[PDB]
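ugh ok so i messed up the first submission bc i forgot one of the chains. this is the corrected input, ALL of the components this time, i swear. 317 residues overall. if the numbers dont match what u have on ur side tell me asap before i send this to the collaborators (the ones from the other lab, u know who)
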Amino acid sequence: SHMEVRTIKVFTTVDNINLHTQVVDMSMTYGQQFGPTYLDGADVTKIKPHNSHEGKTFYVLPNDDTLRVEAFEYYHTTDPSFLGRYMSALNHTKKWKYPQVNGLTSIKWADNNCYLATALLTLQQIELKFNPPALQDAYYRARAGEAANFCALILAYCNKTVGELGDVRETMSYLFQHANLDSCKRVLNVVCKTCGQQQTTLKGVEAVMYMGTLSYEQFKKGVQIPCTCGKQATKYLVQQESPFVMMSAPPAQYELKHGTFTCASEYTGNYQCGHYKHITSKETLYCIDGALLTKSSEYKGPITDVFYKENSYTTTI
Ligand SMILES: [Zn+2]
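and heres the new structure output, hopefully the right one now
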């Protein structure tokens, strides 16, 4: 009747660093013993242990106080589905290719990941330190060329699944949310001919992102925005303290000039499907399109996001 019990030792984890010794019954599934369980991204919840599994590390969900703390300390989230979504993505991104293109880690196109490739390429050209150890650790590996965990983390943090259409501005917003931008400061002035002037200070992520124009110069000169009185008012940059700025707008034909920006994202398509490309300004203009690379002296296209170097700026207005 009853089969002789066989067991193996395995380790469970939520961060792949702190291991937790377990003894599993090879006649029960992982799911029956751990809840949802993953082996390097693969869902083994419904798998019964193999001898080859002995000594291997499995991710589980934070189901006790020790794992909850380890997971928060490593990822800076308490979203219950986070680890599941991170493993589900990782099962895909570990099969993506990450070619070095013009010295930067890119991503060969798959699974609508073009927005991720230009986000990744952008990160490697701006000064940014992540706060979660998971992002620090994974970004370091991504810079070295092994970007699978980093890309799966971006998907998890953004609540995007592999293959879902993503927006670069929104993705960067999530990444900046988890970065140290505390010393970034922006002072704006808005001037209405009827209502007068109103100055506003922004900090952190809101200090480095602007939605409305791609041109940093235009933002220094002034952009027209609605005023509550019904007139159009003029908003201009008074003071900026940050290592970069990101200027974003709905996709519009726009000319990129060598040496006047750091990098940019281009979006061809519509609200339901499209394709992002990346433009970086080095010795010439390089267009990185996943694994593909072209160059040109001028660039014009439907640009959505442009990144600029900064340190300290003060208006003369
Ligand atoms: Zn007004």
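quick check: Residues 82-93 form the longest helix (12 residues). that seems consistent at least. The chain has three domains: 7-62, 88-177, 185-314.
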